[PDB]
Structure formats: C-alpha cells, structure tokens
C-alpha cells in the first residue's frame, strides 16, 4: 500500500479522559498508548500538580474547549458513579467529580440538539454494552484493547474506508429491435 | 529502576505548619517525620526561641514568603477554631493565632483568583473530610499517615506518575480492498 | 454480505451514484446514528437498496 501522513494540527491533538477507579490500571495503559502515538492526553493522575491548584478550573478547562475530544472509559463502576455516586457511596470524591463531568457532558449534548461531536465512549475489559449511558449509545462505542486501531483513527479524525471519487453517470447505447 | 535525587534548592525546602492543640500530639511526630526527610519545618513549638521575640512578625515572615509551603493540620478542633475561636472557645490564644493565620491564607487565596499555590491540607487521624474548610476542599487532601509518601512527593514538587514523552502522530497505510 | 456490499458500493460510486452506506459515512454517522438513518428514510427521492 501507500503511506498517508495526517495534517492534524497540534491544537486538535488534545484529549481528556474521564473514568472510574475500578479501571485505573487499564486507563493508565490506554493513556500510554495514546501518548506514545502522539496524542496529548489530559488525565488527573498525570496532571496532578496542575490539577491541585484548582480542580474545578482544571476540569472546566477541558469541558469548555469544543476542540478537546473527551474519552469516556466505561466500566461497571462508571455507571454506578454517574447514577448514585453521592447516595450509593460514602462520598467518593473521584466519583463525585466523574458525576459532575458526566452532567456537564450531558448538558452540552442536550444544548447542541442531542448531537455528540466530541464524546467518545470506550468499553474496557470488564465492561458490557449495557453499562454505556443511554445517550452515549447513539454513537460509535469502541472496545479496548480490541478496537484500539479504530480509536486511533477516530482521534486522528480519519475515515477507515476511502470512498473513491464519484464518477460520471454512464452513457447509454441504444440498439433497435 | 534508576534512582533519582531531587535537585530542590534549600530555598524551596521551607515548610510552615498550622494546627490545633488536639492534633499537636501527632503534629510532633509529623514534624519529626518531615525533618528526617530533610525539610526545614517551621512550627511554633520548635521555633519558640525566635518566635518569642515577636509572634506576629514570626507568623508574617512565613505568610508573606510565596515560596513557603504551608501545611494545614485538619482536626475536629481546627474547624472549630478557625470558625469561632474568639467566642466559642473561651478566648484560646493558640486558637486565635490559628484563626488569624487561616484568615490570612483565605485573603491570599481570594486575591489570587481563588487559586491555591502553597496551602496543603492534611487530614490527621481524628479528622474527617467534613472538617476541611470549603475552600481547601478544591485541592488535593492528604490523610496522615495514610498518604505520607504522597505528602513527601508533593513537598518535593514531584509527580507520582511521570507520563511518557509524547510521540509523533502515527503514519497511515492505504490498502485497496 | 459486507464484502460484496463494499464491491457493490464501488460499482455504484464508479458509475456516478452517491451511495450513502454506514461504513463510509462513519464520520457523520457517528454524530447521531438515528438522525443519520432518518435523513435517508424521510427523503422520498432517495432510492433504498436492500441487500438480501
């Protein structure tokens, strides 16, 4: 085959990851995979120093930006957090932050007419298709590590299939009978 | 793997501690732990000889210096102090000094746009997350001695996790079907 | 029948028809799958080919 080089500007290489603590290790592996492949992944564990200054400001920095692609790491505990992190648990701080992020994503999704432009749900090894929040089921749900190539393609904003250019309508020959 | 020694200048090794009496028993052990690890911890009990000359000047020296990291020892009596030392606690001098320090911290925190650069809340054994003053809940909260290594890392201004360097965007190969 | 469908779409595109199929419209389809389907279901002028 032939080699194609992406023109993705560095401004469009930002990525933000939201997850639950049950999938922390696989999230670290996923972050390594994204970083080595050139994507600037913003995650709490790695930006701990900056995140400590003002946690809410740090989250809002990525939630405001329309050009940042948010990756949602789906796991059994993610749905649990975004549903009852405050009541079903003994006030888990990370769960509450994840719930806040999910609410902001939902608000943005609704205000846009229920169109998902930059939220990418990813299923992790112990996750099931039932764990995806309903509004996120209306888009491409990737699985990790199964579809990591597809995740890279999506982040690169490239088509997995190159449709050849549309040709001209065929010319018709007329024969008598 | 390979060992690492922080190149932290002795200027950045200054640490100031504010606490309440109930937690003083463990604060002594905490100060010993920090001194063993090479930090210049300034606390009233050990700085007594210099502090005796002028208590207010002694406090102001650490409050003015932006480079001095302040550790807040959170305990049930700490919130009670910083909320009602003057009236509810029969005019406790140490409580009053703690309240004054807290007010100075809040004033600086507000002046900076509600961004916390050098105030480190630490939860001591008899404390709970509810005891942390609200503005201090917006940053990392460390439990002692549960997260002592994390406290050391923070004082060293080092990241517990170091992300791999960002690579170049992957090249895409085109294969006809 | 995915592979033969890809060949069929090649055949249609080469001959000048704008074929909307999920695998090629992945970028737009990802925004809202149901809206993407309804766009072609509503339009009375879009011919639907059913690959049996």
């Amino acid at each position: 085959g032939t080699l194609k080089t992406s023109n993705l500007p560095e401004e469009l290489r930002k990525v933000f990851i939201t997850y639950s603590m049950d999938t922390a290790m696989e999230v670290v592996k996923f972050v390594n995979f994204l970083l080595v492949n050139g994507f600037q992944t913003a995650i709490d564990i790695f930006e701990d120093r900056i995140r400590g200054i003002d946690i809410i400001k740090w989250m809002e920095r990525y939630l405001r930006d329309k050009t940042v692609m948010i990756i949602v790491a789906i796991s059994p505990k993610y749905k649990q957090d975004v549903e009852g992190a405050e009541s079903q648990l003994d006030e888990d701080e990370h769960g509450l932050h994840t719930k806040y992020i999910h609410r902001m994503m939902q608000i943005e999704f609704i205000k846009q007419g229920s169109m998902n432009f930059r939220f990418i749900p990813v299923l992790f090894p112990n996750a099931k298709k039932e764990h995806v929040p309903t509004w996120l089921q209306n888009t491409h749900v990737y699985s990790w590590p199964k579809n990591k190539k597809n995740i890279l393609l999506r982040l690169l904003r490239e088509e997995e299939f190159v449709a050849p250019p549309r040709g001209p309508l065929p010319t018709l020959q007329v024969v008598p009978l | 793997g390979t060992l690492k020694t922080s190149n932290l200048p002795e200027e950045l090794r200054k640490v100031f501690i504010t606490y309440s009496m109930d937690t003083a028993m463990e604060v002594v052990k905490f100060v010993n732990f920090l001194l063993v690890n090479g930090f210049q911890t300034a606390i009233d009990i050990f700085e007594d000889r210099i502090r005796g000359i002028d208590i207010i000047k002694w406090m102001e020296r650490y409050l003015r210096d932006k480079t001095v990291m302040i550790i807040v020892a959170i305990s049930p009596k700490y919130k009670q102090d910083v909320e009602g030392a003057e009236s509810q606690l029969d005019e406790d001098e140490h409580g009053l000094h703690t309240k004054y320090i807290h007010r100075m911290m809040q004033i600086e925190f507000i002046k900076q746009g509600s961004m916390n650069f050098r105030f480190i809340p630490v939860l001591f054994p008899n404390a709970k997350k509810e005891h942390v003053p609200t503005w201090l809940q917006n940053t990392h909260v460390y439990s002692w001695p549960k997260n002592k290594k994390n406290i050391l890392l923070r004082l060293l201004r080092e990241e517990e996790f170091v992300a791999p360097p960002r690579g170049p965007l992957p090249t895409l190969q085109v294969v006809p079907l | 029948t995915a592979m033969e469908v890809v060949k069929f779409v090649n055949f249609l595109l080469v001959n000048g028809f704008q074929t909307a199929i999920d695998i090629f419209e992945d970028r737009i389809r990802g925004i809202d799958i149901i809206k993407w389907m309804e766009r072609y279901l509503r339009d009375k002028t879009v011919m639907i080919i059913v690959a049996i």
Binding site: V36, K149, L152, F161 | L153, V162, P176 | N10
Partner: peptide
C-alpha cells in the same frame, strides 16, 4: 465504467506503547 477505482481501507502503520513509570521513593 470499470470498477478499477477500488475502495481502500486505512490503517496506522507504525505504533508503540508503554513506558509509564511510578515513583516509589
């Protein structure tokens, strides 16, 4: 018109992963 203009699938050729480290004091 002949179907020579085939559809092509795009894949990322070179990739790498790992290299995460954690400080243990």
């Amino acid at each position: 018109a002949e179907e020579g203009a085939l559809v092509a699938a795009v894949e990322p050729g070179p990739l790498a992963d790992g290299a995460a480290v954690r400080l243990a004091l």
